Design an enzyme around this catalytic site. Structure first.
Site, mmCIF file in Angstrom:
data_model
loop_
_atom_site.group_PDB
_atom_site.id
_atom_site.type_symbol
_atom_site.label_atom_id
_atom_site.label_comp_id
_atom_site.label_asym_id
_atom_site.label_seq_id
_atom_site.Cartn_x
_atom_site.Cartn_y
_atom_site.Cartn_z
ATOM 1 N N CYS A 1 0.803 -1.204 0.000
ATOM 2 C CA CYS A 1 0.000 0.000 0.000
ATOM 3 C C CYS A 1 0.834 1.251 0.000
ATOM 4 O O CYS A 1 0.646 2.126 -0.900
ATOM 5 C CB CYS A 1 -1.124 -0.052 1.068
ATOM 6 S SG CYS A 1 -0.559 -0.432 2.750
ATOM 7 N N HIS B 1 -0.919 6.539 8.994
ATOM 8 C CA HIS B 1 -1.489 5.321 8.334
ATOM 9 C C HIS B 1 -2.601 4.780 9.242
ATOM 10 O O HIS B 1 -2.417 4.675 10.432
ATOM 11 C CB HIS B 1 -0.425 4.261 8.166
ATOM 12 C CG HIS B 1 -0.763 3.155 7.199
ATOM 13 N ND1 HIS B 1 -1.713 2.187 7.475
ATOM 14 C CD2 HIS B 1 -0.259 2.834 5.963
ATOM 15 C CE1 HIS B 1 -1.768 1.318 6.470
ATOM 16 N NE2 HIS B 1 -0.926 1.704 5.510
HETATM 17 N N1 LIG Z 1 -4.961 -3.822 4.762
HETATM 18 C C1 LIG Z 1 -4.230 -3.145 3.918
HETATM 19 O O1 LIG Z 1 -4.296 -1.951 3.913
HETATM 20 C C2 LIG Z 1 -3.277 -3.819 2.945
HETATM 21 C C3 LIG Z 1 -2.841 -3.102 1.859
HETATM 22 C C4 LIG Z 1 -1.968 -3.682 0.978
HETATM 23 C C5 LIG Z 1 -1.475 -4.930 1.184
HETATM 24 N N2 LIG Z 1 -1.871 -5.603 2.211
HETATM 25 C C6 LIG Z 1 -1.335 -6.950 2.344
HETATM 26 O O2 LIG Z 1 -2.226 -7.953 1.914
HETATM 27 C C7 LIG Z 1 -2.171 -9.100 2.737
HETATM 28 C C8 LIG Z 1 -3.456 -9.302 3.548
HETATM 29 O O3 LIG Z 1 -3.792 -8.179 4.339
HETATM 30 P P1 LIG Z 1 -5.233 -7.950 4.941
HETATM 31 O O4 LIG Z 1 -5.267 -6.643 5.543
HETATM 32 O O5 LIG Z 1 -6.191 -8.289 3.981
HETATM 33 O O6 LIG Z 1 -5.305 -9.032 6.055
HETATM 34 P P2 LIG Z 1 -6.525 -9.886 6.605
HETATM 35 O O7 LIG Z 1 -6.112 -10.345 7.866
HETATM 36 O O8 LIG Z 1 -7.740 -9.179 6.442
HETATM 37 O O9 LIG Z 1 -6.656 -11.058 5.627
HETATM 38 C C9 LIG Z 1 -5.924 -12.206 5.730
HETATM 39 C C10 LIG Z 1 -6.761 -13.372 5.286
HETATM 40 O O10 LIG Z 1 -5.980 -14.495 5.026
HETATM 41 C C11 LIG Z 1 -6.506 -15.631 5.689
HETATM 42 N N3 LIG Z 1 -5.425 -16.609 5.918
HETATM 43 C C12 LIG Z 1 -4.445 -16.545 6.800
HETATM 44 N N4 LIG Z 1 -3.624 -17.586 6.709
HETATM 45 C C13 LIG Z 1 -4.070 -18.335 5.719
HETATM 46 C C14 LIG Z 1 -3.663 -19.585 5.052
HETATM 47 N N5 LIG Z 1 -2.606 -20.270 5.474
HETATM 48 N N6 LIG Z 1 -4.416 -20.011 4.052
HETATM 49 C C15 LIG Z 1 -5.482 -19.367 3.640
HETATM 50 N N7 LIG Z 1 -5.894 -18.235 4.181
HETATM 51 C C16 LIG Z 1 -5.249 -17.678 5.193
HETATM 52 C C17 LIG Z 1 -7.174 -15.064 6.925
HETATM 53 O O11 LIG Z 1 -8.121 -15.909 7.499
HETATM 54 C C18 LIG Z 1 -7.724 -13.737 6.418
HETATM 55 O O12 LIG Z 1 -9.030 -13.847 5.928
HETATM 56 C C19 LIG Z 1 -0.950 -8.888 3.635
HETATM 57 O O13 LIG Z 1 0.173 -9.400 2.991
HETATM 58 C C20 LIG Z 1 -0.891 -7.366 3.737
HETATM 59 O O14 LIG Z 1 0.365 -6.819 3.961
HETATM 60 C C21 LIG Z 1 -2.741 -5.079 3.083
#
Ligand SMILES: NC(=O)c1ccc[n+]([C@@H]2O[C@H](COP(=O)([O-])OP(=O)(O)OC[C@H]3O[C@@H](n4cnc5c(N)ncnc54)[C@H](O)[C@@H]3O)[C@@H](O)[C@H]2O)c1
Ligand SMILES: NC(=O)c1ccc[n+]([C@@H]2O[C@H](COP(=O)([O-])OP(=O)(O)OC[C@H]3O[C@@H](n4cnc5c(N)ncnc54)[C@H](O)[C@@H]3O)[C@@H](O)[C@H]2O)c1
Ligand SMILES: NC(=O)c1ccc[n+]([C@@H]2O[C@H](COP(=O)([O-])OP(=O)(O)OC[C@H]3O[C@@H](n4cnc5c(N)ncnc54)[C@H](O)[C@@H]3O)[C@@H](O)[C@H]2O)c1
Ligand SMILES: NC(=O)c1ccc[n+]([C@@H]2O[C@H](COP(=O)([O-])OP(=O)(O)OC[C@H]3O[C@@H](n4cnc5c(N)ncnc54)[C@H](O)[C@@H]3O)[C@@H](O)[C@H]2O)c1
Lengths: 323, 340, 334, 339
Positions: B156, B183
């Protein structure tokens, strides 16, 4: 000394540590178990975003926390006492602490009906020397019990329902997402929602006040504050009453009562954070609704769901010594 | 002929990616989501897709079965396989391409598990190391080729910082610079103070009632996207008490002496028609960017030139919906990548 | 004792009271727009700083603390408060936000007050004091003095010592600041009409203008003209931090900068030090105007171009208030 | 042939009314033709466009020095403190006034609009007992051609009224008490401090407290549902969210019931009801922000407690205390056209 092992150095374990320390009176903790580095546990003890910074010297070693020149050994053993993890919430489960030499276990939560549930200053008089595994009830039980106990003695509760407007807790999520147990509401962002939540405190209130078995139900609304909660009770009573009568009657039972207090200054939730009562009766919210001779009576008590409860649990701990 | 997508991790990013692909309609028809993997019931995943505390209720018919979620009558098979190499969606559902959004597969070696399961290509929703390509759409998506198999969509913060830094450097020359991003909190943080994965003293703290300093790699690693800025930037975050919506401040020593209006005009010209790097001069605040579709939104109202004689600092700022703006960037890269 | 009239029993005036009280080994009257009942109530129960460990009540015209009486008035015009004849007011701690000038605070002098200490920036035609940076410029001649802003009291010692050790050529600040009373709970019209001040404070990060960096030369003359900055108002009720990014005369590393600033925090009740990886809540209730945090220092270099980021936390309410009370103590006993 | 509306007071409620009527205009039928407010049009336009609760308006919005412009259309902003001096009837063809300032909250005050030539006035608040208080889809059938000044009740009245009405119709309410768990509002403080009225709770920081607050909606509900006059009381707990509220009702009923019976009986009255909706998906408060109902019945929270012969029944309805109330008011403005 009776030597306490705190299992689960979370919000309640750390706060129990703080309370026992500040009673320095003579109860003492001597060891701790979690899933965590001693470094982060000491850091969490020292700095608390709800309850402020501990006015003590706090540090860690590779296997302990140190406070004011005393060492408190720390473990990272996930399979097992002041039991505060939320993972040993039954007599079957809290079996290992007996299984390695405790005279007793006090579980920091409801833990079934095959053991005793104690709200200090309501029913702690049922404890015996034979009692080894004991529930300190929930936070909501410790707030509701004295209100319903005294209101019932005075006026006779026929039936009642409770709504607690409750601070968010560590079972909830910061942001919407999958949650252990799969519950649709537990799943949702806690800081930006009012979230209905199931509670057993009213339904199981017979474990503390037998004659109220079957007579109460309720629930919670989890709201966007870190701590500090209020329990509303709406009841049909045997006696016809006014709000001033109700308030004067209940108030009497708060006099000198370290468990069930009183505040008539029109306080709000923040004001109870760091208080030492299990329940704080608020007469300013008492309401009697009547038409003809059909009558509803609303009463309310505040509670620091963290520290008030913790203080109740510590009182119950100290009473284990007298057995 | 559509490339079939498996979404791994139906979290904030995976559900929003689903929403984005859906809303695009014909514009996303080169791809098709066919399956979803997570750690939960289809019932809860459907419920989370439908009702979103940040982005509101999805204007679609959403329901769940015992093994799928259903949206506007289309079925999307759901798995709950923690080990990616065991997700049977290539065989069972025709998956060609995995959109990896768990947070648990952010490296070439980890995301290999998807290729071992039979996927052809993987796009990771995060930084995922320097031995694969990191793509900010509309900054460096030209480096993608038909031979790439595992690609990062960056973070992000990378998607916010990169175009600002790219165009500012092109126009003026960044000699060195430092970032602070203010953030929104995210799901790696804690609701109340307590033990936290990694043991970090700040990550352990209650997110809704603290300003919390947080490490970020976006500035230090920006050379992965913009080689000429390798070694020239550092930075960090402050995590603050809002659910979504963030801003990046960049303070730089430039090779040109400038005024704020000069910097504003020079950067603005690169936002014109730019769906990735937008522009807003209405004096907005964080909540106004929630739901926007840019990776980065330049805000000329916060540009500041500080000078004393010939000594100069220049501060520029860009907003971002760290959830949906990033997601929209990742979907743009997805559309390009999937179809090479 | 010099008798203090507090004008404006707001966040700052109430905390000034608490601070004076806790100091033990002062205040005689108070003015605001409100009942003694409500001022008592607000002194007792505070959503940020907790409940006062004192017996508090109210009479019809005064607040009561631990059996001691403090007269209350509700007079919008400072000229008109009769606290000099009625209560012995010799010194006004001016805390309303509405007398923020030598011209305006002149009204207390006309009401019969000897001195005024204004709890805010109050122009450049009087002295602005940051205690433990420049409080030696006070004399007996001074009548109206500025205690600065909360941000000045954070930024000033940081900039002062950094400049002394390294030389600041130019710098810019961003303060990530708790919301304050000038902001709104929900979006709507606000006094002054500013589009950002109009926005809901609890659910936004809101850029906000500040003058502390630009005016820092009033405190530290050799930094006149060399600093600018702004604020981001964020969704917490108190507790703030100031980041400074500067070009220095000397080449440095982070460890060097940390050691050099830290020596000036040793025994320094105004400018403290914390390397425990604290967060904002942790500074609420602290008595420093500024708390250096070496964990956030950063030095960015490519060839011979170098930027230095340093940060200091502050309880924008109580830390500032403790600063103001230090200056009060000095100023009133001259 | 369109109904033409003049909005007095372009606050949160006036602005949401503008947004609602704009969106209905997309195409039953009503348009805003003018505004009266004392704030600069530039700021008003800015607040129409961006909103921290309800998101950005998907329209082109700008300002002139005496109007707001949306999608090419000019909306004059008058700035008359006395409503009898607003010229929007002959200038702009205003038929009905939506009175949202808070300062004309009575029959006798809002006469001023009729003196300026408005046909009818709807007040966005409780406004006494000598005019009619209308909850759309509960008692809007009582309106007649003679009703020129009408109250919309409160936001709380619009949530509680249909729940109480249908529950009483089905089972008979003998007595009841309400607790609304309500989003913070503009009348509250960001940080603790002195407050207009001097109230000790109104004085406290709204974002970090649960704050008890007096309400009149239950006590006054006889204005809407006469048989419930004298039968209900209640209060609010103001909590740390920007919008989205719920009303709990606890009642003694004439009939013995089960939870399922109560749920079915109330549910059937929500069906196709644009004013009193239904949701059984286990929603939370944010999910109601931007919904168009005055009240949303939630059967998942229904509870019946019973010991021998004594029975209490708890029922709950959610509401967007801003936008659901606003949509109720616009429904009533449209009904005005049929009188
Ligand atoms: N929230 C943000 O602003 C944002 C922005 C850009 C990138 N990201 C990145 O994207 C990714 C996810 O972030 P998020 O905020 O959505 O997190 P989140 O916690 O909402 O989502 C993670 C999901 O993955 C699932 N999960 C975890 N381990 C797993 C496995 N072994 N197999 C299958 N599913 C699994 C969880 O149950 C959950 O639903 C991270 O790498 C994060 O850095 C997040
Ligand atoms: N928070 C309240 O308001 C409150 C009030 C009363 C009771 N309780 C109860 O107290 C208990 C704990 O609540 P909390 O709020 O302190 O939660 P918490 O999450 O703060 O604390 C739980 C702690 O236990 C540790 N833990 C988890 N599994 C463990 C294991 N197998 N072995 C050892 N340690 C383990 C965790 O690492 C964590 O530090 C729960 O049963 C809860 O219902 C909470
Ligand atoms: N809050 C902070 O962090 C902070 C820190 C440092 C300085 N300050 C400064 O201190 C001053 C007050 O700030 P605050 O946060 O306490 O605000 P506040 O709103 O809490 O307090 C202002 C008080 O002054 C009263 N008041 C207003 N007009 C008055 C008049 N004409 N006569 C008498 N009383 C009147 C109000 O009723 C209110 O109680 C401002 O100048 C502010 O810039 C604030
Ligand atoms: N805020 C809410 O969510 C809410 C909910 C239900 C009901 N209400 C009610 O609706 C009304 C206002 O609420 P709001 O939230 O929209 O108000 P607001 O405070 O958000 O706006 C009030 C507006 O009225 C204008 N105004 C004041 N005096 C005026 C005059 N003499 N002539 C013309 N314009 C004038 C102001 O300039 C301002 O723009 C009140 O009747 C209130 O009780 C509000």
């Amino acid at each position: 000394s009776v030597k306490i092992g705190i299992n689960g150095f979370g919000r309640i374990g750390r706060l129990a540590f703080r309370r026992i320390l500040e009673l320095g009176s003579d109860i003492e903790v001597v060891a701790i178990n979690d899933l965590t580095s001693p470094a982060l546990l000491a850091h969490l003890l020292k700095y608390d975003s709800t309850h402020g910074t501990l006015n003590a010297d706090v540090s860690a070693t590779d296997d302990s926390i140190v406070v004011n020149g005393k060492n408190y050994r720390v473990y990272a053993e996930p399979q097992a006492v002041l039991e505060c993890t939320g993972f040993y919430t039954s007599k079957a489960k809290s079996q290992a602490h007996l299984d390695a030499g405790a005279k007793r276990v006090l579980i920091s939560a409801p833990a079934g009906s095959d053991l005793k549930t104690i709200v200090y200053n309501v029913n702690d008089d049922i404890l015996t020397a034979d009692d080894r595994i004991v529930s300190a009830g929930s936070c909501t039980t410790n707030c509701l019990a004295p209100l319903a106990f005294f209101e019932n003695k005075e006026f006779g509760i026929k039936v009642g329902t409770m709504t607690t407007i409750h601070a968010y807790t560590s079972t909830q999520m910061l942001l919407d997402g999958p949650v252990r147990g799969g519950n649709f509401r537990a799943a949702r962002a806690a800081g930006v929602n009012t979230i209905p939540h199931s509670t057993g405190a009213a339904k199981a209130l017979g474990l503390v006040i037998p004659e109220l078995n079957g007579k109460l139900q309720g629930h919670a609304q989890r709201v966007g504050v870190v701590d500090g909660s209020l329990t509303e009770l709406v009841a049909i009573l045997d006696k016809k009453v006014t709000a001033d009568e109700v308030n004067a009657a209940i108030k009497k039972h708060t006099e000198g009562n370290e468990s069930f207090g009183y505040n008539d200054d029109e306080i709000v939730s923040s004001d109870v954070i760091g208080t030492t009562f299990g329940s704080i009766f608020d007469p300013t919210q008492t309401e009697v609704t009547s038409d003809g001779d059909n009558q509803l009576v609303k009463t309310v008590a505040w509670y620091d769901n963290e520290y008030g409860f913790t203080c109740q649990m510590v009182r119950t701990l100290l009473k284990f010594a007298t057995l």
